[PDB]
């Protein structure tokens, strides 16, 4: 179990697979218009071909936009990568606006990759050789192969490896009796340890010792990693590897933390497209979600609007609660949505509608359910009542001090006096608003 | 070789003939041939690369092609010339100047090629025989004319068992500086198979002389000459854009040193371009900088988008066109993009339409046209991929028109927001 | 005395 | 490769005016950051008392 | 130490997830600095030519009365500093 | 090359007298005949913290007499270009780019002897001695013309095992610096081995020690900057790369005070020589009041260097103060620091001729029709224009067969590029749909 | 030939033209007429070397360019070396690795000097012979007057023998450190006593102290590397320090002086720290210039005369400058051209003086190289009248050139 | 605490021979402010490992 969060009961956009909205389904009620629109997209996003698009959830302060925005999330699943972001997130003091943003963009981009070792593991038992002839002159026979016992919990198997990995062996220095781990796509050996079937009464020796290596002698096993490309851009930009004193430097913050265009182009994407065209990973494009959109500065959308027109980005769901408002950074430009009418051609609009008192008494006694809790049929009119006059935020809202006090009152379901006096014991905006104005 | 399809991903080059005519719709452009005429001049005057430091200003409303005309520009012109893309507010960093950052981008798009004649030994190892007692042996390499011996020395052993190469394996050796190189496994490379292998990925033998000459190229550009030369940390190229180079001797040294590099023919030059989308968010200071940055001999040629007109310059309160002042639109040559008309619209759409794989019907066509031609070419055009959709959802063969119709109904363009903006909206 | 000898023959492919 | 290295020629009484043996406070008794490293929370809480 | 690298942690083995969770495919491609010098020592070589203008001995000597227990710690710490990193510098050689 | 590669001087006569046409220059006789004054009181060396203020219109030229002030002093004086906009620096102050570029406008001429070891070594055996570290190094240097062992410090013993070297082979020594090279191993051990992973150089000739001369050019800035950064060696101050590695934001301490006195103790001695360059500062109109300011004890220094802005503005407000206005954009305050110099807007004639000079230096062969054709073009437009459209034209002719340009090229070239008149025009017309 | 310091804008100052009872002299040591202000400064000079009184700061106004610098540098020049004269541009402060109060109060520091003095006994002479057993060896030193032996110590003998062991060397050796510097091959060999104690004597600023004791390696004077110095121990145990070492015999401080030119760049925030740095008894005096009247300080929208605000003002004392006339403007360029190699005629002094009272004093004075040097193009010897002519006509100036702007340029 | 400091070489071969109690005890009634406890434990002091560059 976790925190019931304010969108922990959205699951889905509960369409028909015409296309067409449903009543109440995955948790969203009414927004159909939105809904199928916001589906449309979903498979426009299913289709990772034709990307560099964005769309724009415009509306009132609260409608459905986020809802529905991370509901994308649910339809879509935890498989492809959906990287949210508000406005604000973009001023940096270690870091350029217009690098933020290119990180977000190529890191809402995943990367499945998958690969396949094989792998050995078994306390050794023995290692003998495979005497031959000599292939020269008579200085003496050589050896052919070196045979070695492997012994586990499932059996005791005789393998067969090679003079260089019988002096990998020997410059490794490990005796008979000890766990050791083969591969034989690299070929590399690694000591494990001693087995715990041979472990000591007194012997202080840590070596995170081996346990009985159960299983198989030889087990083949594939891994499927999901990493991001803004992942392999910060591993390549500040590397953490061993003794090679430009490393070293680990014990700095290290600001001026900004990528390059020539790697981000001649390095980690020649090896991506390699790796998929030679079938080791397959590519997941992904969303970007933008919420508080108007947030961002000229600049911020100038830089937007030229990488979305990129080959490369993901799509991106930008989400947008003002009307016409001046936009940042410029001294007196009024466009609408805080948006510029540039970006505005550039991306799609839908029109978050707003709710009606059956619709938010709907989302009321979803929330109630989500929240856990026992509502009655009056209390939940009541709230639909003093919702329709406040926004569906402050309605909503009044379900847990409402149900502490139920609780304290020795109630099991939320009653009519207690949400009237919870609406007496705390205002919303319009109500401070007025004493606000009332009082100097 | 998946990379999806952008906005620009269906123009391959100008749709221009040998004599810079522009074609009505070759090449994936379509329309705007005096603007596409003006880009094949440029073309051709920065692929002969003898001037430096030439301007050139795309101005023209929006959505009509400036962007495309530059991404053409930079297919036409292909690898081997630097291209260089950025958006005006790009420069904007906080750990380098604005005049830092758009050196950065000038020196960025110079290209310095070293030609070298560095001879090797390409051919397929038979046999690696050595002694230790200083160890001693020989090599067998074989190709498919002829076979010859080697005896290795001491680091020659040592960087073959560092490489690990071992018989059957096709290798290339730098007589230079004995660097190794493996290039496969050869049918011989066949292990036989019994023991724990994992590889059987052969291939052929190398062909031809057995120790050739063949030329190598290394092509750097100024821009990543002078961060390596920056300070001992010579991995700033990917490490991370730290920046900030004086312009004491090491820039000038730069410049310098490849002046008589170009003069004895090591390296001389290849010039680039710089296309500047959106150049409306350089600041005063950036355009009074640029105005003697393009007055150096190893300025590239740059190419500066343009939608606004009569506009304040950014950082001041001059009124000035293309939001450029004057003292910078001198420099300039300003060539002028038109809206496209109802055939061009229809003939961008199609074009569009078949490059993303949809197929639509006549009608599709013609309302997708009328939508086009009352609102933005961009908005038509994003409604293609949307109608699809649905057309895909219903199990469809071809977009029709109650598809496209579905969609407009469904989404809204920014005409149509604000007319719906009718409430407060919390302003 | 302690003579290593490295090789690596191509079998008869 | 220059020569005259520009040695400070500063004074001789500053090289160090801090240094003063019987005029400093025992500061170790207020040293919590040298703990974090060295000093385990079983040693503290449960041993010495 | 690998918080959220792509590459995985060091695994004493295959016997729990760390080692089973991560891919060599994925590791390599990560270049560490010393790759990174490897793969551009064929242009270090050539394009590595930028001369200071003037050259300055150690930093600056002191002129001083100063009391013994001075210059004995500084050649400590300096000891130590050389013992633990010069070992680390010898890949800058090369660019030095 | 283009835009400044026609001017190289100011074609003065011996008289200081402003010729007609020469030296890639026509018409601007007073400017160019008082920009000669400016250079000889450079030449003289006798003077400091001198300024001057090329003033005009865009493209009159104020930046071809700037340069051509440069080609006149040779390249044997510093001349350092730099853009007001350069101040502006995110890791050092802004004062400081505007005193550093100062120090390095102005330059110093030293000869000195530097010594040198070279030769194929024959054995390297190092001296060993309880402390227990290496005591010294006994090298054997082998050359053409003798040989020699000589002993070296551990610290070139190290530099040799960084080196990776062993006996036998070539290296190049120098005890100023202590920089070790390794050549390669000498080429008579070439034949030991079929091929290796080793470089090959013949015996170094000559004496095995010599000591050479060389008479090197390094600006005060240098200097400032070697002391300020030091990286020299012996030490482990290689940590430089992350002490804290900006620009080291100098102090005036040391730039005033240690380094004058150690050049000064240079050149009184026969081992320097001052050479002070010329500072030309383009673009001053967006210097910030702050270092307009400045500039009046950077001018009022007796150290400062001949500085020459460049005025391209009529009367505009001051940057950094948003509510006062000066002539040139510079506050009266350093104009009366300056000798303005005025720089005559081009009539028809002259720039007929600067078209024809600029197409001669960009290797064009255009008519006369074409060249009398940019002469109306040029009077309908700027000259930096109507000599912008030059080789577009030669392009196109190319492209049609022709040997030279006619009227019809131009004409196609102007038809396809607009002006930034023309496009204002456009803009204004269209005012409603630009944006 | 040519030295780093050249002839400039005031290297004809060569201090205050004061009799022994401060009493301006018509014309002495450069400095020309401005008697009033020239008198003013003699007293802040001198109770400057008095030092008693802590904490003054007097401003100096008047027209644009009337002496403003002049009298500063030589108020410097008349205070001599051994006395820190710390002159700073009103924007030197505004940095980035330091705030500008930080920047403001580094500079009251620097104006801060304190006297110590100590004997160290320190030889000179040349080397005749080293040896060395592997470790103690043996050197041998002479002087043109007398010859010794040394038995030296390890690091002694180590030092010696980093260099050419054999003879040749005239070295140094401060017996306190042992630090060696071989002047050349025996440059001459020193004449008396091969080792004599000799007396040193340091005038160490605050700021120097406080950046020598404040890090390991603390000697980042060198390139400002003293980022926000710690008040908290740095430097109020600097200041205990320093006024213990006073009153013992140990050392004595001498308050320097501060020259902030053009001050009206600082801003109410410079102004509200100055307000109590100038009342610490470790204030050094200063002295502060301005161009401007009555306008605005740079932080609000405030009209202040100067640009300095009241409760500041109130906090200085003001000296007026009045404008110079005919004789004091030809006495001023016949001054220049006697400290440049210029030459000019008696017609040419008067028309040049005509010159430079049309429009202004710098206008002739800058003119006045540039006649010479136009003189010099037609093989003369003098600078005539003609001359002057054709640089007036060369050159402009800023009133005639603000008034040939009947053609209109970028804005 | 253990803070030897080697203040140098006696006079009798260098500083004079201390002339008191070697066994100096007296009690350090000196004052110290609560910031330069936070000051003291902002950063660590020590060194023998890779904690020396911080210095
Ligand atoms: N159709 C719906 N069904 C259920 N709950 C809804 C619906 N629409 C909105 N809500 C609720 O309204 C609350 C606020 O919506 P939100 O996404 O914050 O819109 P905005 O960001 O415009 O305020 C959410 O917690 C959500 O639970
Ligand atoms: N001549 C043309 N041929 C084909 N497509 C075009 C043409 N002109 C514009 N387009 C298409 O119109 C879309 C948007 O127009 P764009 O080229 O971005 O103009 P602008 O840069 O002025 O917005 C692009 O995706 C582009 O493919
Ligand atoms: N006297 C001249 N002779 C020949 N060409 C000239 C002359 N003056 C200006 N030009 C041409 O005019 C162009 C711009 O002049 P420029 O020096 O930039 O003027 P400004 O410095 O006022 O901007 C230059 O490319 C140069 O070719
Ligand atoms: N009384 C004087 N005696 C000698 N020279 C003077 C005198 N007054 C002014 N000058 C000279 O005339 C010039 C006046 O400029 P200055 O007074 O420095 O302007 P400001 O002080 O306003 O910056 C200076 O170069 C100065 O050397």
């Not at chain 1, 449903?22 to 289709?47: D, M, P, T, Y």
């Not at chain 4, 043996?21 to 040693?43: A, K, N």
Request: aromatic share 6%; glycine share 8%; with cysteine.
């Amino acid at each position: 179990t976790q925190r019931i969060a304010s969108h922990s009961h959205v699951k889905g956009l509960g369409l028909d697979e015409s296309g067409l909205a449903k009543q109440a389904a995955s948790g969203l009620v009414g927004q159909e218009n939105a809904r199928e629109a916001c589906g449309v997209i979903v498979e426009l996003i299913k289709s990772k071909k034709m990307a560099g698009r964005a769309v724009l959830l415009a509306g009132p302060p609260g409608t459905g936009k986020t809802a529905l925005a991370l509901a994308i999330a649910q339809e879509l699943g935890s498989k492809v990568p959906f990287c949210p972001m508000v406005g604000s997130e973009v001023y940096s003091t270690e870091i350029k606006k217009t690098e933020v943003l290119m990180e977000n963009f190529r890191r809402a981009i995943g990367l499945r990759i998958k690969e396949t070792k094989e792998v050995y593991e078994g306390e050794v038992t023995e290692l003998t050789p495979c005497e031959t002839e000599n292939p020269m002159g008579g200085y003496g026979k050589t050896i052919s192969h070196v045979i070695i016992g492997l012994k586990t919990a499932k059996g005791t198997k005789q393998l067969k490896l090679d003079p260089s990995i019988f002096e990998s062996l020997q410059k490794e220095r490990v005796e008979a009796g000890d766990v050791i781990y083969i591969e034989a796509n690299s070929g590399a050996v690694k000591r494990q340890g001693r087995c715990d079937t041979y472990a000591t009464e007194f012997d202080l020796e840590a070596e995170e010792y081996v346990p009985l290596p159960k299983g198989d002698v030889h087990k083949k096993k594939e891994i499927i990693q999901d990493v991001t490309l803004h992942d392999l851009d910060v591993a390549n930009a500040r590397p953490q590897g061993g003794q090679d004193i430009l490393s070293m430097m680990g014990q700095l913050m290290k600001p001026k933390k900004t990528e390059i265009t020539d790697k981000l182009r001649g390095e980690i994407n020649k090896v991506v497209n390699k790796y998929i065209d030679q079938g080791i990973a397959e590519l997941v494009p992904g969303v970007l979600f933008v919420d508080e959109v108007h947030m961002l500065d000229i600049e911020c959308f100038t830089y937007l609007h030229r990488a979305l027109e990129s080959s490369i980005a993901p799509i991106v769901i930008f989400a947008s609660n003002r009307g016409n408002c001046v936009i940042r950074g410029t001294e007196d430009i009024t466009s609408p949505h805080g948006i510029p009418l540039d970006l505005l051609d550039r991306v799609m609009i839908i029109r978050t509608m707003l709710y009606t008192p059956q619709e938010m008494k709907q989302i009321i006694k979803i929330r109630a359910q989500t929240e856990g809790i026992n509502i009655s049929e009056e209390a939940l009119n009541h709230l639909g009542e003093i919702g329709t006059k406040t926004t569906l935020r402050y309605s909503v809202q009044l379900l847990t001090p409402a149900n502490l006090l139920a609780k304290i009152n020795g109630k099991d379901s939320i009653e009519k006096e207690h949400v009237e006096e919870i609406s007496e014991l705390f205002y919303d905006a319009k109500s401070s608003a007025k004493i606000l104005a009332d009082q100097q | 070789r998946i990379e999806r399809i952008g906005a620009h991903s269906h123009i391959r080059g100008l749709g221009l003939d040998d004599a810079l005519e522009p074609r009505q719709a070759s090449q994936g452009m379509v329309g705007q041939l005096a603007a596409r005429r003006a880009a094949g001049v440029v073309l051709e005057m920065i692929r002969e690369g003898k001037i430096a430091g030439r301007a050139v200003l795309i101005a023209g409303q929006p959505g009509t092609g400036k962007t495309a005309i530059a991404m053409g520009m930079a297919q036409a012109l292909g690898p081997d010339t630097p291209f260089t893309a950025i958006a005006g507010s790009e420069i904007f960093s906080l750990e380098m100047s604005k005049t830092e950052a758009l050196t950065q981008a000038f020196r960025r798009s110079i290209g310095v090629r070293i030609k070298e004649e560095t001879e090797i030994i390409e051919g397929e190892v038979v046999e690696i025989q050595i002694d230790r007692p200083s160890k001693v042996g020989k090599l067998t390499l074989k190709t498919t004319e002829m076979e010859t011996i080697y005896d290795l020395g001491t680091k020659m052993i040592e960087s073959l068992t560092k490489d690990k190469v071992q018989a059957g394996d096709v290798i290339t050796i730098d007589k230079a500086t004995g660097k190794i190189s493996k290039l496969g496994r050869s049918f011989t490379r066949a292990r036989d198979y019994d023991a724990m292998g994992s590889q059987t990925k052969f291939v052929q033998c190398p062909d031809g002389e057995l120790q050739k000459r063949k030329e190598v190229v290394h092509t750097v550009s100024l821009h990543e000459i002078d961060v390596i030369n920056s300070r001992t940390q010579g991995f700033l190229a990917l490490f991370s854009g730290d920046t900030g180079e004086i312009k004491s001797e090491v820039r000038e040294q730069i410049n310098a040193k490849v002046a008589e590099w170009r003069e004895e023919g090591k390296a001389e030059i290849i010039p680039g371009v710089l296309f500047i989308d959106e150049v409306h968010m350089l600041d005063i200071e950036s355009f009074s900088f640029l105005n003697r940055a393009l007055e150096s001999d190893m300025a590239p040629v740059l190419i500066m988008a343009t939608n606004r007109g009569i506009t304040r310059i950014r950082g001041t309160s001059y009124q000035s066109p293309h939001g450029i002042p004057i003292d910078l639109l001198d420099r300039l040559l300003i060539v002028s993009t038109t809206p496209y008309s109802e055939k061009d619209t229809k003939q961008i759409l199609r074009i569009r339409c078949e490059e993303e794989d949809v197929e639509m019907s006549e009608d599709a066509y013609t309302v997708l046209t009328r939508i086009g031609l009352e609102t933005s070419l961009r908005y038509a055009i994003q409604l293609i991929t949307a109608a699809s959709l649905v057309c895909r959802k219903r199990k469809g063969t071809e977009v029709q028109v109650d598809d496209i119709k579905r969609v407009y109904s469904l989404f809204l363009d920014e005409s149509r927001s604000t007319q719906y903006m009718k409430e407060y909206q919390d302003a | 005395g302690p003579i290593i000898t490295y090789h690596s023959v191509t079998v008869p492919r | 490769i220059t020569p005259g290295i520009c040695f400070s020629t500063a004074s001789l009484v500053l090289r160090a005016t801090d240094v003063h043996p019987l005029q400093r406070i025992d500061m170790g008794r207020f040293d919590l950051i040298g703990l974090e490293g060295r000093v385990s929370r079983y040693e503290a809480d449960t041993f010495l008392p | 130490q690998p918080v959220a690298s792509p590459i995985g942690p060091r695994s004493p083995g295959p016997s729990h997830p760390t080692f089973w969770t991560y891919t060599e495919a994925a590791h390599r491609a990560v270049l560490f600095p010393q790759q990174r010098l490897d793969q551009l020592s064929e242009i270090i070589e050539r394009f590595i030519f930028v001369m200071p203008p003037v050259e300055a001995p150690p930093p600056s000597l002191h002129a001083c009365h100063p009391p013994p227990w001075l210059a004995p710690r500084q050649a400590a710490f300096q000891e130590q500093l050389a013992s633990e990193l010069w070992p680390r510098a010898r890949p800058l050689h090369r660019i030095v």
